[PDB]
Amino acid sequence: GRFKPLAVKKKYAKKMNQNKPVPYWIRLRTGNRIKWNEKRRHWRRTKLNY
Amino acid sequence: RKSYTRPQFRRPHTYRKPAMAKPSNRVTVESKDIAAFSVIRYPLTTDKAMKKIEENNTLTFIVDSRANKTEIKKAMRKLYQVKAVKVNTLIRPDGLKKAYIRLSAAHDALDTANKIGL
Amino acid sequence: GAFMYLNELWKKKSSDVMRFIQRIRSWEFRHQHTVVRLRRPTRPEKARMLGYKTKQGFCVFRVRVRRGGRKRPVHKGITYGKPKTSGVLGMKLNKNNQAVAEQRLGKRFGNLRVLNSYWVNMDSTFKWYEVIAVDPMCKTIRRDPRINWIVNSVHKHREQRGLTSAGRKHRGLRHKGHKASKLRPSYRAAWRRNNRIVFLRKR
Amino acid sequence: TKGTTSMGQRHGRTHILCRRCGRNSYHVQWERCAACAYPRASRRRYNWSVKAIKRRRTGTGRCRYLKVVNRRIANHFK
Amino acid sequence: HHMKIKDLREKSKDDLLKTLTEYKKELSQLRVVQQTGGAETRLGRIRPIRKSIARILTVLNQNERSNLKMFYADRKLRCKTPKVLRAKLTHRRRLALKENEKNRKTSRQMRQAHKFPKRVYAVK
Amino acid sequence: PKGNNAIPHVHQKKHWNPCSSQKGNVKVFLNQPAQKHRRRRLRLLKAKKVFPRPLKALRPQVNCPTVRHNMKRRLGRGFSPAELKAAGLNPQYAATIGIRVDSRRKNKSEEGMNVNVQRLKTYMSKLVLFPM
Amino acid sequence: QRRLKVPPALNQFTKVLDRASRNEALKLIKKYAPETRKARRERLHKAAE
RNA sequence: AGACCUGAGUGUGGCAGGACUACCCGCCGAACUUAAGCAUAUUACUCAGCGGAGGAAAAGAAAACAACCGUGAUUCUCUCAGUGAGCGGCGAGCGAAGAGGGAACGAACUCGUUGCCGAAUCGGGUCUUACAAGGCCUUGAGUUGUGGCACAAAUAUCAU
Ligand SMILES: [Mg+2]
Ligand SMILES: [Mg+2]
Ligand SMILES: [Mg+2]
Ligand SMILES: [Mg+2]
Ligand SMILES: [Mg+2]
Ligand SMILES: [Mg+2]
Ligand SMILES: [Mg+2]
Ligand SMILES: [Mg+2]
Ligand SMILES: [Mg+2]
Ligand SMILES: [Mg+2]
Ligand SMILES: [Mg+2]
Ligand SMILES: [Mg+2]
Ligand SMILES: [Mg+2]
Ligand SMILES: [Mg+2]
Ligand SMILES: [Mg+2]
Ligand SMILES: [Mg+2]
Ligand SMILES: [Mg+2]
Ligand SMILES: [Mg+2]
Ligand SMILES: [Mg+2]
Ligand SMILES: [Mg+2]
Ligand SMILES: [Mg+2]
Ligand SMILES: [Mg+2]
Ligand SMILES: [Mg+2]
Ligand SMILES: [Mg+2]
């Protein structure tokens, strides 16, 4: 709630950044296979627990 | 016959030569620069980071995470030749360590953001 | 020569003189640790024949091994399945004490290449083998071709694999003829050899 | 009872993050990683799960020094 | 534009460390710009100016590794150099046997190489 | 049903099949054509390396042992100290000029060494041994 | 090894000479002592010089 | 009031652990299954378990086979041989070896003993183009034996 180690804090911060959409300069690339991010977590759906 | 006034035998205090102070475990060069440019990495421009330059005399730099409130002051003075009184820090929910920095009330903060180009 | 006389004292190992020497020396051995570094070997005759020279880089250890048959480790002394395995105390460990002695010294002292070992003493409780070990990186060992071979890296834990003479004993080697038709080169090399299902291309 | 009600009593943590295995199997009370046996020098590794060995072998990660040293020893140097 | 290494090798340590602290400050304020405006002309100098600090720390390390090698790779007494400068090669290539042995033989093994050498005979 | 079949005795009851659970214990020779090429490639490449020496050494005639084979002659390894002594050559020096030496054969019948003593001096005739 | 019943073969070494002639026995052994790696290497050197 | 012996302490110089494990080596080691039941047996000297190396490992130079007109390290292969061997509730099942044709193979060697030597050894230096298959200083190890040489009542050993 208020106690999280800094290491456990560094690992949720690395997840708050991974939870951004694919930028719309990626899907005009020549031959990419990416249309969606397909690794977006939602805090309710699935939990990280770390 | 040596005088032992103890129930135990504690190890005798023999001579203890010091180590040799090996030369170094590295070659890689260092400087005065990298010690002060790694700490203060870039200032911050937000609705709150701007409201604190004018109203207060603070600045906002996104310092590196493993820095030190005493070494943000040294770094300021080494980079921006201004004094720092209170350096409040916080590791944001991005793993990035922000830093608020009072400029001694003698270096106007609004004269550095205009110098530093914030 | 000098060897002929030490070698014959130890062959008369049950006399009252040699058994006095062993009755006092089996007594300090019982108040020393399991593994003990020695300066000289107790049996120079039997050590120097097993490949021990008194150069640098050669070290000798007494290792103590508890005597008697190994007891199968089954919870509560309870064994399950076929009564083939019903016994718990009468198994014998298929690896002689001298190999176990040599392998105790290997797990502990990983920087040494165990070479051989020999019998030094046994009471009715313990049994001490002096294991002849070599420091594979003392420059003496390095530049001496009689024992260079052990610096090579295939000999790192020859003790752990039964490559020492004590290991070569319980591996059924040391019989060559019809006496080891399934022992050669190993229990499984022969086993793989006899139980592979070979398929020629043209059958 | 022993279903949705008892699922409410799920307060603690049995396991936290393993400093060596990097996963969530570090049993707190008796401090050992349930998946790499940390602080045991040897990582746990059992042939009865080859599939889990494969999730944990070399090459499954970055493999920094080897992608380099395997290049030096395959070019006559070491 | 930036530092060109072919003309940068000839520089000295004290001359590099002033060359360095100036590319740091130049990039220090390019990450100020990168915050507020986009300014691809004012911006965009990062990737050349950040790989010029790279090829200065390179030549700095390329040099003070040699100076500390033409000082430790010496016939000096007890010649133990730091293990970071000792010719690196795999843990076992470092233990195995150098060339000066693995070819070394006793007496009564040299002397058969002479008495009874191997011959280059041919059969007719 | 069964009936008037030979009692099978097939001996395939020891997990030889490399199934999903067992690693298998079968030796299939799908590489023997590669190996025949592999060996003849080493052989023909070892022969031009040992050149001008003969690739194979000289081996004597020996009598195959049992009553089934005693009339069949065969090439055994090494000659003996005896043939070499009865032909001059030091078995230390015979073992370095292509002659193969066997310190274990016993020359039980003079008949035996006579075929081989003379078999040496054929070689020792048609051998150049040009010095270094 | 003072308590036990020391056999008559190992006892032999606990009935040594006395200090009377022991120093004399060490006098001979001392003056007829070998050459000390320095008068050995310069002795066989005069065997070439 | 010192040597030696047995132990310490840190100073230097190193090493070991860990990963990988298909193959390989040691130990450990089942059971399901088969026997139309099942306890011997079989599965299997297998799986799992512990340990340990290598590019291969292991084995290897006869305390071997044979009984012949003899063969001659190990390994591998075809074969002997699913065996008129044999083991086996002699049931289910199991089950090799010599020989033979091959592959490979310039494959052999060195300690200890023995005799003759007895520090010629080893290590720290140093000197030399790094030369440590050497020079020349070294008690520092070592005589509780490092090293050298010879191979049999038959040879020739042994020194200039
Ligand atoms: Mg120093
Ligand atoms: Mg101790
Ligand atoms: Mg000890
Ligand atoms: Mg001790
Ligand atoms: Mg003792
Ligand atoms: Mg010592
Ligand atoms: Mg071997
Ligand atoms: Mg065979
Ligand atoms: Mg706790
Ligand atoms: Mg621990
Ligand atoms: Mg493990
Ligand atoms: Mg002692
Ligand atoms: Mg001492
Ligand atoms: Mg140390
Ligand atoms: Mg450990
Ligand atoms: Mg290991
Ligand atoms: Mg059944
Ligand atoms: Mg079985
Ligand atoms: Mg297993
Ligand atoms: Mg080998
Ligand atoms: Mg068949
Ligand atoms: Mg069986
Ligand atoms: Mg044959
Ligand atoms: Mg000797």
User: Mapped to the 3 state alphabet, what secondary structure does C102-150 carry?
Assistant: HHHHHHHCCCCEEEEEEEEEECCCEEEEEEEEECCCCHHHHCCCCCHHH
Contacts of E82 in chain B (CB under 8 A): 22-26
User: What number of other Cβ atoms are within 10 A of residue C27's Cβ?
Assistant: 13
Structure tokens at F70: 């005693």
Structure tokens at A11: 């690992």
Q: Determine whether the interchain pair G7/C24 forms a contact, defined as Cβ–Cβ distance below 8 Å.
A: no
Chains F and D touch (3+ CB pairs under 8 A): no
Is the distance from CB of F120 to CB of F83 less than 8 angstroms? yes
Structure tokens at D26: 């570090």
Specify which residues F73 forms β-bridges with: F63
Distance C55 CA to H121 C1' (A): 9
Is the distance from CB of B41 to CB of B64 less than 8 angstroms? yes
Burial label, F51 (beta-carbon count in 10 A; 0-12, 13-18, 19+): exposed
CA distance F84 to F105: 12
Q: Where are the alpha helices (DSSP H) in E8-106?
A: 13-36, 46-50, 54-67
Specify which residues F62 forms β-bridges with: F74
Which 3 state secondary structure label does DSSP give A45? Answer: coil
- Give D 15-34 residues with CB within 8 A of chain A: 17, 24
Resolution of the solved structure (Å)? 2.8
Of F69, F11, E65, E7, the residue nearest B28 (C-alpha): E65
Structure tokens at C135: 């420091």
Contacts of E65 in chain B (CB under 8 A): 27
Closest residue to C199, CB basis, from F12, F14, F26: F26
Give the residue on F whose Cα is nearest the Cα of E117.
F96
| d(CA C180, ligand 22 centre) in Å | 16
- What are the DSSP calls for D18-59, one per residue? -TTT-SS-EETTTTEETTT-TTSSSPP--TT-HHHHHTTSTT
Is the distance from CB of B76 to CB of B40 less than 8 angstroms? yes
Give the residue on G whose Cα is nearest the Cα of C17.
G7
Nearest-5° Cα angle at C162, C159 to C163: 80
Structure tokens at C131: 């294991």
Which 3 state secondary structure label does DSSP give B102? Answer: strand
Amino acid at position G18, single letter: D
Q: Determine whether the interchain pair A8/D24 forms a contact, defined as Cβ–Cβ distance below 8 Å.
A: no
Structure tokens at E111: 């002397």
Tell me the C-alpha to C-alpha distance, in Å, between residue B58 and each of C61, E108, F127, G2: 71, 87, 100, 90
Distance B117 CA to H58 C1' (A): 74
Ramachandran quadrant class, C51 (left: phi over 0; alpha: psi -120 to 50; beta: rest): left
| d(CA C123, ligand 17 centre) in Å | 49
Amino acid at position C38, single letter: L
| d(CA F1, ligand 8 centre) in Å | 41
Sequence-distant (6+) residues with CB within 8 A of C112 are C59, C105, C106, C133, C134, C135, C136
Nucleotides of H under 7 A from a protein CB: 5-32, 39-79, 81-83, 92-115, 119-126, 130, 132-133, 136-150
CA distance C59 to C131: 9
Interface check F97 vs E, CB under 8 A: yes
DSSP state of B49: H
HEC per residue, C1-36 = CHHHHHHHHHHCCCCHHHHHHHHHHHHHHHHCCCEE
| B56 annotated as a binding-site residue | no
CA distance E50 to E43: 12
Q: Using a 7 Å CB cutoff, list residues 6-35 of G near strand H.
A: 34
State whether the beta carbon of C181 lies below 7 angstroms from any atom of strand H.
yes
Tell me the C-alpha to C-alpha distance, in Å, between residue B105 and each of B24, B53, B59, B108: 44, 11, 12, 6
State whether the beta carbon of D58 lies below 7 angstroms from any atom of strand H.
yes
Q: Determine whether the interchain pair F92/E117 forms a contact, defined as Cβ–Cβ distance below 8 Å.
A: no
Structure tokens at D28: 């707190």
Specify which residues C24 forms β-bridges with: none
CA distance B51 to B109: 11
Is the distance from CB of B67 to CB of B97 less than 8 angstroms? yes
Is the distance from CB of C5 to CB of C102 less than 8 angstroms? no
DSSP state of F58: B
List chains adjacent to chain A, taking adjacency as at least 3 C-beta pairs closer than 8 Å.
B, D
CA distance B34 to B21: 26
Is the distance from CB of B61 to CB of B115 less than 8 angstroms? no
Q: Note every long-range contact of A8-13, with CB atoms under 8 Å and residues 24 or more positions apart, other chains counting.
A: A8/A50, A8/D17, A9/B91, A9/B93, A9/B95, A10/B95, A11/A48, A11/A50, A11/D17, A12/A48, A12/A50, A12/B93, A13/B92, A13/B93, A13/B94, A13/B95, A13/B96
Cα of F44 vs its chain's centroid, Å: 18
Is the distance from CB of B98 to CB of B61 less than 8 angstroms? yes
State whether the beta carbon of F24 lies below 7 angstroms from any atom of strand H.
no
- Closest nucleotide (CA of E105 to C1')? H133
Structure tokens at B98: 């922000």
Angle of helix E13-36 relative to helix E54-67, nearest 10 degrees, comes to: 160
Structure tokens at C26: 């089996």
State whether the beta carbon of C186 lies below 7 angstroms from any atom of strand H.
yes
CA distance D42 to D53: 14
Query: Secondary structure of chain E: what % helix, strand, coil (to 5)?
Result: 40, 0, 55
Amino acid at position B18, single letter: P
Q: Determine whether the interchain pair A11/D24 forms a contact, defined as Cβ–Cβ distance below 8 Å.
A: no
CA distance A40 to C185: 59
Element containing residue F112 per DSSP (H, E): helix F110-123
